[PDB]
Every structure is written in C-alpha cells, then in structure tokens.
Amino acid sequence: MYARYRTRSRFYKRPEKMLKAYNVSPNLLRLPKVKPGLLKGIYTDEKIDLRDRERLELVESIRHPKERDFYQDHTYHNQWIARDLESHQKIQIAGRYPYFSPDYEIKPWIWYPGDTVEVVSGEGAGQRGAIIAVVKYKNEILVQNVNVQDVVIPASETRPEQVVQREHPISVLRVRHVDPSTNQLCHLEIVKVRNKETGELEERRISLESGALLPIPAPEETVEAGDPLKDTAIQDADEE
Amino acid sequence: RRFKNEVGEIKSLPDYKVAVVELDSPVSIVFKQ
Amino acid sequence: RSDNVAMYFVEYKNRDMSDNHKGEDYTAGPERFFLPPRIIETEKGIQRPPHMQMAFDRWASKFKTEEFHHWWRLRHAKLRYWGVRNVPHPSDVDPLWTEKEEEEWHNEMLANT
Amino acid sequence: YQRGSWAPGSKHQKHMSLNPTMYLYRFAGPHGPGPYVMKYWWTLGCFPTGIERPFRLPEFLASYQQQHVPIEVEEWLQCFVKNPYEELKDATSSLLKCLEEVPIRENTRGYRSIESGVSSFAAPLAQFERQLNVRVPSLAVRAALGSPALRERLKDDLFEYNESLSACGSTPHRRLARLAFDEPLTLPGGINNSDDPNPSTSDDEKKLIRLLTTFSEGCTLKEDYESAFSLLSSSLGFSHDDNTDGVVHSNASAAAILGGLYKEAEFHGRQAALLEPQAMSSRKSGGRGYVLWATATAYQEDFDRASRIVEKGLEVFPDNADLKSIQEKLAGAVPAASSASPLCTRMVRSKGQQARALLHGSGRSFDNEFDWVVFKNKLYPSKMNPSSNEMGSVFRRVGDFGGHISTSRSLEP
Amino acid sequence: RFNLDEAAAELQLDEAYVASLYKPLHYTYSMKGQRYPAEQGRTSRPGSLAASRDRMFPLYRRNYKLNRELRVLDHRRIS
Amino acid sequence: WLTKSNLPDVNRWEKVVNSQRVTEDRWALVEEDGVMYQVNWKMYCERLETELQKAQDQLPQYSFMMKAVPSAWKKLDIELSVLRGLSVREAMAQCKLSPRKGHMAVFRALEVAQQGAEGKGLDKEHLRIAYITCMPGPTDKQVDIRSRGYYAWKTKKSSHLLLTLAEDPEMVLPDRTAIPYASLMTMKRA
Amino acid sequence: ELFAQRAQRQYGHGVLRHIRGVAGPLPDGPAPPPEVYMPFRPFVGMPVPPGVRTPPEPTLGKVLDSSSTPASRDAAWYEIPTQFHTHTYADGTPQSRSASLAKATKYIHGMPHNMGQLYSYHRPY
Amino acid sequence: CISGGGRGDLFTRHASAFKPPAFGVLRGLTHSSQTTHPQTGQLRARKLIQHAMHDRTLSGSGHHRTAVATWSYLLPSLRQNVEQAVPDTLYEKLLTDEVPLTPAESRQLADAHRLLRFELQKRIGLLEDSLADAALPYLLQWPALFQRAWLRLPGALVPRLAQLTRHVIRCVEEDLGRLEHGSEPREDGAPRSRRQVTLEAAWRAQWASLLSWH
Amino acid sequence: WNPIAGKIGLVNRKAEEWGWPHQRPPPTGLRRSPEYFPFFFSRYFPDVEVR
Amino acid sequence: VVQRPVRDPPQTLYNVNPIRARFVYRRDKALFDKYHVTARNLAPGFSQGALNSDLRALGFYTPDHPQVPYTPL
Amino acid sequence: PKRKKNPMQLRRKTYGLHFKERYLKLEEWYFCPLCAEPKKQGEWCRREDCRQIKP
RNA sequence: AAUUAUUAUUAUAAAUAUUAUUUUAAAAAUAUAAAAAUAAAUUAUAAC
C-alpha cells in the first residue's frame, strides 16, 4: 500500500505577483474590506511564525545535526563600519518619528492645557472636551474623553497583565476652539497692541468672530524639587 | 566602547585611560547591607 | 540522527553473580558520567571490589578541578566555531562539578572512613 | 562565465573576474529572511555577512516601550486593578447567560450528531477561571452541554453557585485578605471589597467545587482524564475541613485510574483512606474511602498491599458491596498474581498512558537520546552529553591536564 | 595524587610557572596564537549578561609578569 | 497612494456637489427581493467581519498554519502525501517513526496544533487530519565558492505548512494495542 | 501512628495538589491608597480612589476684553537656517556657535543623559 | 465563492465583482470559439463556468461545513446584528425615553433598520425550516429582536414575516401552556426542577412584556 | 586619528577664543602667554573627569 | 468521493510477512539472557508465526512433525 | 541535459516502485505493552525490563 | 591563496606533554594499492 503524492504544478512555475502601480491597490475602494482572513481565503485559527525568537529551540533542533552553520559568533566582513538602512527601512522610520525634521512644531503655539476645544474631522467628528495636556513638539493634544483607548500594561512576575483605559494624543491639525461666547469655529492669534487697559498693553489670544481675547498661561515649573543636602539656598547665591 | 542603538546606528563612548593606581592601604566601599 | 546508523546495546549476560556490577542498573546513565551508576534499590550498601574504585576515584576526581571546567567551556567555543549547532555560548555554561552539588553524592560516603 | 543574473542572490553560475563577489556567507534571499539567517538574528545579533544592519527597533517597541511604567505610576497601578469578586459575580452571570442559549445536542439516529460550537461562551469562561486560576478545557463545558444527563445538572449548578456568590461573598478571597486582616492589626487589607482566617469550606467553596466536578463530569464523558485530573486536584486548594477534603480526594483518585497515573491514584485514595469514615457506613460513601486506595493497587499489580487494605476495609465498614467484591476479586488472580509475581512486569493497561507516550515519549530517528540531549533546560547536541563518556562523546578525548596520570591505558587517556 | 603545586615545592619554581608548561604558550606569554572567537566574550543582551575571556578563563590569562622575567630582558640590565 | 493621506476615513466617500468637496456616507449595493438598496458600508462590513468570524469558530476544526519550516518544499510535500488522510493518532505515530526531517517538522507542528485545539474545545481522540498543504516559503542564500574562480549561490529553501484538523465522531481506529505473539512469551518471567 | 506518620513525609514530598492556590479567586484586589495625593491624571474609566486627592485642572484664567508690521522688508526670511544645528544654549545667546555643538554632538553621536536601556545586541558593555 | 451565498450567506458577487479580461479564463470553455464570444449568461455555458470557479462553498468536498440553517444559529446570530448596529445606548434612549435621539443617532437607527431587511431577506427561507425543531429558548427572542431595531413586530417578506410571526406566537404559548402542566423533562440528571422555576417564569414574564410593545 | 590639519577647525577655534569676524585678535604677547584666556581658564579652572 | 474512512493501516502484525518469515527459525541464543523460551518466534500450529493464518486441526499430513489441536484465539 | 522536462514527465518518476518504496510507505507498529510508546517488532528499548524480555 | 579550504606563512630558537575533528551492514568499472615467475635495488601486474 502507498500514497498518491500527485505532484503539484505550482512547484514547476510559481505564478507571479500582482504588483501595485503607484502603491495603488486597484479595486480596494470597490469591494468590501473585512478581517484579512475571511474573504482572502486562507483562514487559520492560530498562525505561528517560526522565525521569531521564542520558537528558536523549536527550529534550531528540527534541522539535522549534520547541518552545520558557521559564523555563529563572528562575522566575516567588518561590521563596525557605519552603514545605512534598507530603502523600505527608512520609509518605515521616517513616518514614525517625523518631528525630527527642523521646526516640526506649529509656528505659533496656540494650544494650551485647559483650552476649550472641539475636534473637527476624522474619528468622532464634532465632540467637545477641554485639553488637559499638550505634546508641543508633536503638534498634538490630549483631550478629555476624545479618542480614548485601552493602554495595556504588560508587567513582570509581580503584577499580572494590567489594562488601563486612557485617551490618546490627537493632532492639533484636526481640532478647533470652543469660543466661550459663540461656541463655533474660531482661530486664535497671539496679538499685540493695547485696547482697554491691558497690563502689557497687549492681548494674548484673540478670537476673530466674537473678539473676546484669551490669555496665554505659563507651563508649570516643579514646586517640590530640591535636595536640601546639596542645594545652596537662595541667599548663598545672593552674596555678591 | 562602541555600541549600536535600537535602530542600529553605530555610536561610541568617549575614549578614556585605565590607571591602576597602586595605593598603600587597602580601601573598600561599605555597601549598605 | 547524525547518520542513520542503528544503535545496538551490547552487554554481558550474567550480572547477578558478577563482582563489580552485581546490582547496577542501565536504564539511563549516571548523573554526570563520573559517578558510580544507578543501583538496584534492593542493594544500596553493596560492597564493590576495593580496587576497581581506586581506578575510578583516581579518575572521577580529575573532572572536579577548575581547569577541567575551563576545558568544558572552551570545548563549546571549539564547537560553535567548528560549526556544530545547538551549542550554547561559553558564557552561560554551568560547571560540570561544583562543591555544593557533590554533597548529594557525599550522602552514601561512609564506607571506610 | 556569468550565466545567470548579476545580483548576489542570483540562480546560475558566475565568475570572480566578470562579477567579482564579496564573500557573503549567508544573506537574505529575495523573499525574506528564512529560518536559517534568523538563527543569527537572535543569537549573533546581525546577519552573519556583517554587511546588513540590525534594525532591532520594532522589537523594542514590542517589549520595552510596552513594559515602561515610571516610578510615580508603578506603586499606584495595583490600587486600580478590578475587584475580581465582580468579574466573578459578573462573568458567572454572563457565563450562564450563554450556557442557557447553547443548543441541546441533536439526537438523530444512524450517526452521532456533532456537539455544539464553543465560541459562544469561550470569552466569559475565559474570565471566570482566569480570576480563579483553575483553567478549564472548553470541551468539558462543551460536552456537558451535549450530554443529556449533564446539560441540566451543570447549568443549574452554576445558577445555584451564582446564587451562593451573589448572596455570600468570595470566600477563597477573604481567606487571602484575612491573612492581611488577622493577627491583630488595624490593617484589614481594604474593607474586604467582597461583600455588600478560620472558616470551614464555605457555602460557595462547596458549590464552587460542586460545578468543578460537574465540569470534570463532562471530561470523563469525553474521556479526557488528565485534564479532569487538573480540574479536580485544583479544587484541592478549596477544602480546609476534612469532610469535603476526603470527598474531593475520592474524586481525584476516581479520575487517576483512567488517566493512567497509577501511582498518584494511591495518594489521592490514601487521603480518602484517612478522612472518610466520619459518617454512617451504611451509605455507599463509607466504603468508597478505602476501595480507591486498594483498587489503585489491584491496578498497580502489588496484590499483597492490596490484600491488606481490602482487609482493613472489612473491619471498619461492615458491608461495602464494592469493597466486598474486591475481597473476592483478589481470589481470581490467585495464584496467577501471587505465583506469577515478578517485581517489574507492568503490562501497561489503559490509554491514558498509551496516549501520553505518543506525546511526551521518546521517538525514533528524532527526539531520542541520540539527537539532542537537554541539560539545564539547554539543548546540547548528542555529542556533548555529560551523562555518558560513551563513543562519540567529546569526553573520551578530555586528557589529563598535565596533572596526575589517572589512567592506566596506553592509547586511551 | 600528583599535584603540580605540591610538586613545584620540590622544584622551587612557582605555582604560575609549572602550569604555563602544561597549557599552550599563548595562554601565558606574548607569542602569536588565536583563541576561538566564541571565547572572545559577548555584550549584554536584553536577556543575557556580559562575558569576558578574563572572567571566563581566569586560568588562560596571559601572565604578562612571568614573561618579564623569562623571555624579555630589561633596559636596566644592560646599562 | 497612501491610505493615511489619500483616504482619511474609509467609512466616508468624498464627492463634489456644486464644486464643494463634500464627504457623504459610504454604502454598498447589497441584495434585496430583486432590488439593490444601499446600506451603510461600515455596517455592511461589520456583519461579514462577525458573521463569518462567528461562522468559522463554530466549525469543528483547528486551522493552523506554521510559517517558515526549515526544509525544502519539494521534499516536504512527498512526505506529507503519506499523512494525507491519516488520523492524528496514527500521524503523530507514523511521523515519530520515519527518519526524515519533514516528519519531525510535522510532529512538532502536529503537537502545537493539537494542544491548541484542546483550548478550542475539540476532543483529542476523534481528531483527524483534513487538509495539510505545502507552500514555498522564504529562501536564504549561501555563496558557493567553486573552482577556477567560479561560484554559485546555494539557496536554503524554507516552506510553510498549512494544516487543518477536522473532527469526525465516527472515526473508528484499527487496533494498534495488539502485542505480537513472540512478545507474548512474557509468560516466562511472569 | 507516629511511625506511619513518618511515611506521610515519604507519601508527601510528591504532593502535586499545591500548585494552584497561589492567587486565589481574587488574585489581588485594588490595594488601599498608598498616600493622600496622586501625581498623575486619573485614568479614564477608572473612578478615582475614595479620599485620595487628585491634582487640580489649572484651567486658563478667565479673560476680560502701534505700527503693526511694515511690508517694506522681506527680511523675514530666516537669515540663519533652521537646518543648522542650534546653539544648544537655551540661555538666549549662541553657545560657542559651532565650537560647542561639536562638544555637544559627542553627546549626540554618543549617548544622551536621559538614555535608558537600549535594546540592541551591540551594547556598550 | 462565485454567486456568493447560494442560499445561506449574505455576501455575493454582483456588479462589484468585476470581469477580469486578462487571464486564462478557467473553465466552461467547452469550445475554443469561447474566446471571442464566450456567450456566458446562457445557462448551460454558465453552469460549466460557474461551478469550477471560486469554490461553490463546500469547505473541501468532504471537509466540515457550517450548520447555518438551524434556529440555534440564525437567531443568536440575529442577536449580534442588532446588538452591534444598534448598541444599547440607542436601545436605552429609545426604549426608555420617547424624546428624539438626534439626527445622527436617528440615522444609525435607520442605518440598521434596512440592515434587518437584509439579513432577513437572505436568511428567511432558512428560518421557516428549523422552525419545526426550533426550541423555546430560541423561539422567544424572535420578538425580542425587532425591538432593538425599533420595528413593531406585526415572495415578498411582509407576507412571509406575518405568517411566520403568527406561526411562532402559537408555538410559544403552546410551550408556555405546555409548561403549566409540564411533564417530567428529566427524571434523571436533574429530577429536581431547579433553575427551571425562575428561568421559565421570567420567560412567561418577558414574553408578555413585548406583547403590549408589539 | 587623521593627521591632516583641517581648515574650518581653526576658524571655529578662532571664534571660540575670541569672536573672530567681529572682535580683533588678541595681541600675540598675550595670545602666547599663560594669561591667554583659554590657557588662563586652565591653571585656575581645570576641567577633568576622574571616574 | 465525499470522504472515505481514514487511511489508517489495519493490524498487519498478525499476517504473514516476507520479512518476518526469515525470523521464525532464526537462531537467537545471544539475544536473551535470563528469560529463555523454547522457540520464541514460532507460533506452533500456525504458518510462519502468523496468528491470522491459522492451520491447526485442519486436515494436513506430516507423519513426522508434531501438531497441536485447535483452540480459538 | 538535452532539454527541459514537462510536468507530466517529472511525475513519470513517481509511477514505479523505487519511488513508492522510498517515500510513500507506512510502517506497521504497536505500543510496547510496557514501554508504552509505539514500536516496530525487533527493535527494543533500553529499560532493563524492555530489554530482558523483548516486547 | 575569495574560505573556518591542497598550508609548520619560520628571521630565529629548539627536544621523551596520549594536549584533542573525520560518518557509513553488500555488487561492478575505475582510482590508490598489492603473497607467487621469463646479486642488486627495478619491472610489467590491466592478479589475492
């Protein structure tokens, strides 16, 4: 008794890839897009990648003892030369950390903790919530109850896997301010020149529609910072 | 000492010198234990 | 697995009336290949010949030195360079014979002194 | 010269004059790093040619940047974990909210019908046990819903324990909190956050075990014993009084005979042999505390130890029909047990060990002791086996280290 | 049993000289020879610690002092 | 093309009405009694993402693709045609006795794909192999220094091993417990 | 008896039932407040603990209602490029100009001071 | 799967599954003339083509296929449809208050209105068959569905939804009338009718709760 | 270490011992003296790191 | 063919085997040590130790070789 | 070689017995009544029981 | 010498360290290598 083995055709000449022109998948916009395993066709219930690190003892033992692989510890060419990355590698690393460009911040900074701002476009277009924190160098914002996600907290043997919900930094490019009078769209420019006994003879954040200005507060410095055993008091720094 | 960061860009720690100073008296450090 | 060579287990037949392996067991080897191998639990304090240990204790006590440990670890460096896979780096290599580990074998060590 | 293409990963032959290569040992092909150039990527650090550069970033955003919590957030997080008494009183209500909706297994003759799917309640059940730390196989709770005798006993044993958890509190919790509460100290460990240690097995701690065996009753009805043995022996942390302790010790040993483990079948029965007799020996429970501690020896082939326990069960407990038959069941193997009494002939009986050697057992031509011996959880190639200096093994050529000549041999040091 | 150290007392040389005779002459002195590139030691991975072939083979370390007395002469011996 | 910039929200669909870039809702031309009426394209896809995902999970199998098995595929296939149809009790049994690596590859995968199904609520006994395929995988390349200054590139081919363990209740198995007769002269010694 | 009780130790030491009760049914509940004040903003969905004091939300203070710019110059275009590595002197003056970026680029090509555990396998030590 | 859902599935391939003009057209090319005038659409030059195309869903000609025809699947499936296209936040503001939700949420109420008219029109033919062997635990949510879709519960679908809804109503009261004098369902395994008291009482409770609603 | 003496190296050590394009060069009697600031800040303000 | 029963092989350990046939009478003294039997391989009465190919008590003729009478299995 | 091989000709190799008697063959086996693992008749364990008697 | 490859890279100094890489249960051609005959070391030998 024996099996069939019915040698396959796709081992003779493998059909070719359908390459995208201008990275455009042609009819992505035409047919529905569901979980990548359901209409695609190869539905697995648990994919295992063997090239990972966890599964090293599973592959390094499957191969024969007669399959010796040299250069286990030392490489041949000099690897302490400095080298670039793959083309595709930069493309991934430029999109992650874009602020490394010169002057990525927004030229005037008008978003501050405590501002009354509403989102405009994208996910949940139209919700209102006050800023609590601002990531300036990134042109984004932390706003209450808007774009909230579950920050999972992996932990070592002490604590178990902890999950924590937390709203996320959202870009300031998609939020605008809730005018304390008109409650509509309103741009906000640092303004100069005196109107009605302004202390420095200047407004600090002017609304265009209603005209009621706004101040620009100061970020907070630490109050409970200092080592009394190593911090010269303010007077020994004042003895001319 | 050299090293490569997470991306894999070659970096180095400024060169130094190791001076084995022969002291006269055995000195230690009383690590609080 | 290296070469598909069928391994046979040759042995001598009569080992009950034997002298030196009167009650030894060969299911699996000893703990570290330089110990008196496993014994049939019915005969623990069985007296082996007094000289076939003098060629063993003299021998099983060369794998107890720090220089052997510096052979056991070096041997890995030799292997991974020699291409043998699955040989863990000579950095994290447990020593063969330690001091505290031996007390477990110092258990049945009250024969003559 | 130069028959294929000009790339280094080409297919046909080449020449070093026309297309001078740099000697690259092993680089990545056009379709990605196979499992051969990654054996370095996790040991050497970079691909072995040295020319490629080790972009170890997205792993760093996998492990570290995920496992970062600054000091001023570490100490406060555990104060924000959930109250597992709730996901015990919420999941158990949701777990039931699906266990009621699972179809009754079809009954059409001519062919066995297929058991209902399990995706319905796999998610709430994943919550129930995860707080209890007693992981149950969905098959137990998928064949239970199928069996005509257990589909109702099981579900209702959940409705009743849910009742005796939303009436009382999670008593195996307070047991951990009363540690942080007793030994007089003003600190209770929270206000106990479980309602509105010296107790016995509480109401729930009895009904908790109740459905565990009822879970483990579907296991036997599918005959997956060594997972049932992990269900019963896990409830063994829930009995603190010696009445139910012997009951659950009877269950475990009533699942170790089938499971193939014939050693632990004694211990689990020997505890049933030290906790059982407190009640009137007329009920079929009185005798059961001894039979298992002696049936497990009629299964372990040492009939002379079994010839005494069935004797000790005769004196105390008057007439246990099961214990009575074992008295005569030991008279059929006579003398074929006592005459043919070798100390090592153990004809493996059941499937629980017939199956547990198809896995977890040595194989041929791979996984044997000649392929890769493991030593301190590290795989060693067959040569480097410290448990033998047999041929092939590198210990044959160790030497003598310039030290004492410790060998009498001539060509073999 | 034969012990080199308890033997060198009969020869008076020293501990660290009798041994250098019973291991290759690159593990004590300053001649040419290459050890194996796994013995070279590693860095400290996320998982594993560091290594160094003076912490891995403290016995195989070059005895640069004993080379001073035997194979290389001083400058204050020929003034 | 850039889905982050060329398509901000896929639930929308931008048009031009009266020279105004307006973004209406996205729909789909789903079926009816014989008409085609547009339903929410985010709602039309929330069903399929679930009604299918909830279709498969209630199918007594355990689909399990192990990627990057370290072996050529043309040699891996020939030793998977033996296992086609074998019950898991007699596939882990016949992979553990044959010498080839491809069987050590399957056995390790046929174990991880066996315990994984237990947490999925499938019995260990009535498991029977249903589909087991072999796709070509990613390849490596050693330089092959040869004589006369020539050289070539030894390609170290890997493969994928897609496998699905169906479940059939009425799968009765041939007796393998049967000890031979010559071994049943275990009467001596017992 | 006390002699068969000795076998309970031999019967013991092979007791496999004691590998579950480590966490209990409530592996751990929210511990009581460690202090009176927490430094971080509350997590969403998590009600603030009872009695603990949360930092304020110092919302922006309530508000109350010559030559602007002459177009006689395009000198607005930066007469020192933003691409040029800055003076690194947040004091307000150019710190040594180039002289000193090279001293502080050692701090860049090397490792910064905030730098925690790098992930790669080529590590400093 | 060409034609998508023959009977069961919602998915199909209509006017958005294009015609690919550059490939070796697989099957049904009985004659070589079928290159310049394949003349599909003809029913016989189509069964040749349509059968060998994207698998006529069979899991593999012996693999396990799904049991979708049964009330134990369709109706706990329809539970998840309206429990997602209409989250309880819409159900609360509809069931409790009569005040208008908002235009948006009124669209999400009508976006899912005509989503029931789809999964119904597709899987109605199946609902009537397993109605025979349907169980009361599943015959009891058939009114409890059209609430979260906010539709008053009482060929084309309307003719067939009526007769079916009338058909189920009796079978529910039959069972409920079969419960008051309920025989012994299990004298063994659960001869004590526990959990059957409250669960079947709340059924009789929650059955008449929708009646005034419907 | 590259021996070749660069060009911009000095033109930056010019402006860092005395503003080069603006301020005038220090007289050489002072420039080549222990009172030349870069050397001055060295006999009374050492900067070493003995770790 | 929708689906056959599994392709599992039947128990052929009890049938005649051209490979095992060479072992019915193969001298094997040095194989066992303590538990020696009269003739381990040879199932008496059967053809070549094949417990499925039963022949005893069926009419043959061998006036000079023994034969055991029929028993079930 | 003198040409390339069409697929119907690389399968021609798999018709004869020298191919089926090398790849597509399954061994008769059985559980050792003691060693508990599968086994072929003839090759034995290392256990002193699986080795004294020969299951 | 493209290499972890036919290799004592030997200017020098040297003399009793077992000082640490070589699979396979068949048959032919070939390849190395091998008792006997038409005072020496040789043959050819396409012979064990």
CSV table of N, CA and C in Angstrom, one decimal, chain D residues 15-65:
chain,number,residue,atom,x,y,z
D,15,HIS,N,31.4,34.1,-12.2
D,15,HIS,CA,32.8,34.1,-12.2
D,15,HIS,C,33.3,35.3,-11.4
D,16,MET,N,34.5,35.1,-10.8
D,16,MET,CA,35.0,36.2,-10.0
D,16,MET,C,35.7,37.3,-10.8
D,17,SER,N,36.0,37.1,-12.1
D,17,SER,CA,36.5,38.1,-12.9
D,17,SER,C,35.4,39.1,-13.4
D,18,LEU,N,34.4,38.6,-14.1
D,18,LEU,CA,33.4,39.4,-14.6
D,18,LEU,C,32.6,40.0,-13.4
D,19,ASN,N,32.1,39.2,-12.5
D,19,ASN,CA,31.2,39.6,-11.4
D,19,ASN,C,31.9,39.3,-10.1
D,20,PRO,N,32.9,40.1,-9.7
D,20,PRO,CA,33.6,39.7,-8.5
D,20,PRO,C,32.8,39.9,-7.3
D,21,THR,N,32.6,38.8,-6.5
D,21,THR,CA,31.7,38.9,-5.3
D,21,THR,C,32.6,39.3,-4.1
D,22,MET,N,31.9,39.9,-3.2
D,22,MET,CA,32.4,39.8,-1.8
D,22,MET,C,31.9,38.5,-1.2
D,23,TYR,N,32.8,37.8,-0.5
D,23,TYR,CA,32.4,36.5,0.1
D,23,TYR,C,31.4,36.7,1.2
D,24,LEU,N,30.1,36.6,0.8
D,24,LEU,CA,29.0,36.7,1.8
D,24,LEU,C,28.5,35.3,2.1
D,25,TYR,N,28.8,34.9,3.4
D,25,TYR,CA,28.4,33.6,3.8
D,25,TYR,C,27.0,33.3,3.6
D,26,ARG,N,26.1,34.0,4.3
D,26,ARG,CA,24.6,33.7,4.2
D,26,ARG,C,23.9,35.0,4.4
D,27,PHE,N,23.2,35.4,3.3
D,27,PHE,CA,22.4,36.6,3.4
D,27,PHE,C,21.0,36.3,3.1
D,28,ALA,N,20.1,37.3,3.1
D,28,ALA,CA,18.7,37.0,3.0
D,28,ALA,C,18.3,37.0,1.5
D,29,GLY,N,17.4,36.1,1.1
D,29,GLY,CA,17.0,35.9,-0.2
D,29,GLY,C,16.0,37.0,-0.6
D,30,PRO,N,15.5,36.9,-1.8
D,30,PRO,CA,14.6,38.0,-2.3
D,30,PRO,C,13.2,37.9,-1.7
D,31,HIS,N,12.9,36.8,-1.0
D,31,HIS,CA,11.6,36.6,-0.4
D,31,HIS,C,11.6,36.7,1.1
D,32,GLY,N,12.7,37.1,1.7
D,32,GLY,CA,12.7,37.4,3.1
D,32,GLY,C,13.7,36.5,3.9
D,33,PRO,N,13.9,36.9,5.1
D,33,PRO,CA,14.9,36.1,5.9
D,33,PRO,C,14.2,34.8,6.4
D,34,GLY,N,14.7,33.7,5.8
D,34,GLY,CA,14.3,32.4,6.2
D,34,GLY,C,14.7,32.1,7.6
D,35,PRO,N,14.4,30.9,8.1
D,35,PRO,CA,14.7,30.5,9.4
D,35,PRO,C,16.2,30.1,9.6
D,36,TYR,N,17.0,30.3,8.6
D,36,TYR,CA,18.4,30.0,8.7
D,36,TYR,C,19.3,31.2,9.0
D,37,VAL,N,18.9,32.4,8.4
D,37,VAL,CA,19.6,33.6,8.7
D,37,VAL,C,19.0,34.3,9.9
D,38,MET,N,18.0,33.7,10.5
D,38,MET,CA,17.4,34.3,11.8
D,38,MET,C,18.0,33.6,13.0
D,39,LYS,N,18.5,32.4,12.8
D,39,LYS,CA,19.3,31.7,13.9
D,39,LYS,C,20.4,32.6,14.3
D,40,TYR,N,20.9,33.5,13.5
D,40,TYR,CA,21.9,34.5,13.9
D,40,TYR,C,21.1,35.7,14.4
D,41,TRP,N,20.1,36.2,13.8
D,41,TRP,CA,19.4,37.4,14.2
D,41,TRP,C,18.9,37.3,15.6
D,42,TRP,N,18.8,36.2,16.2
D,42,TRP,CA,18.5,36.0,17.6
D,42,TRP,C,19.7,35.6,18.5
D,43,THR,N,20.8,35.2,17.9
D,43,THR,CA,22.0,34.8,18.6
D,43,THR,C,23.2,35.7,18.3
D,44,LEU,N,23.6,35.8,17.0
D,44,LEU,CA,24.7,36.6,16.6
D,44,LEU,C,24.4,38.1,16.8
D,45,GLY,N,23.1,38.4,16.5
D,45,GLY,CA,22.7,39.8,16.7
D,45,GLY,C,22.4,40.4,15.3
D,46,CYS,N,23.2,40.1,14.3
D,46,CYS,CA,23.1,40.6,13.0
D,46,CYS,C,23.3,39.5,12.0
D,47,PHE,N,22.9,39.6,10.8
D,47,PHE,CA,23.1,38.6,9.8
D,47,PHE,C,24.6,38.3,9.6
D,48,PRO,N,25.0,37.1,9.4
D,48,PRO,CA,26.4,36.7,9.6
D,48,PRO,C,27.3,37.3,8.5
D,49,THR,N,26.8,37.9,7.5
D,49,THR,CA,27.7,38.5,6.5
D,49,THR,C,28.4,39.8,7.0
D,50,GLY,N,27.8,40.4,8.0
D,50,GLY,CA,28.3,41.7,8.6
D,50,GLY,C,27.8,42.9,7.8
D,51,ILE,N,27.4,42.7,6.5
D,51,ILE,CA,27.1,43.9,5.7
D,51,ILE,C,25.7,44.4,6.1
D,52,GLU,N,24.8,43.6,6.4
D,52,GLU,CA,23.4,44.1,6.7
D,52,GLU,C,23.5,44.7,8.1
D,53,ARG,N,22.5,45.6,8.4
D,53,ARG,CA,22.5,46.4,9.6
D,53,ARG,C,21.3,46.0,10.5
D,54,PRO,N,21.5,45.8,11.8
D,54,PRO,CA,20.5,45.2,12.6
D,54,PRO,C,19.4,46.2,13.2
D,55,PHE,N,18.4,46.4,12.4
D,55,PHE,CA,17.2,47.2,12.7
D,55,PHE,C,16.4,46.4,13.8
D,56,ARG,N,16.9,46.5,15.0
D,56,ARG,CA,16.2,45.9,16.2
D,56,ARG,C,15.1,46.8,16.8
D,57,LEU,N,14.5,47.7,16.0
D,57,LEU,CA,13.6,48.6,16.6
D,57,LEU,C,12.2,48.0,16.9
D,58,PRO,N,11.5,47.5,16.0
D,58,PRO,CA,10.1,47.1,16.3
D,58,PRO,C,10.0,46.0,17.3
D,59,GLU,N,11.0,45.3,17.7
D,59,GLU,CA,11.0,44.5,18.9
D,59,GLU,C,11.1,45.4,20.1
D,60,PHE,N,11.9,46.4,20.1
D,60,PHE,CA,12.0,47.3,21.2
D,60,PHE,C,10.7,48.0,21.5
D,61,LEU,N,9.9,48.3,20.4
D,61,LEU,CA,8.5,48.8,20.6
D,61,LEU,C,7.6,47.7,20.9
D,62,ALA,N,8.1,46.4,20.9
D,62,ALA,CA,7.3,45.3,21.3
D,62,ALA,C,7.4,45.0,22.8
D,63,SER,N,8.7,45.0,23.3
D,63,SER,CA,8.9,44.6,24.7
D,63,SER,C,9.0,45.8,25.6
D,64,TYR,N,10.0,46.6,25.4
D,64,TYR,CA,10.4,47.6,26.4
D,64,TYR,C,9.3,48.8,26.4
D,65,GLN,N,9.2,49.5,25.3
D,65,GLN,CA,8.3,50.6,25.3
D,65,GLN,C,6.9,50.2,25.8
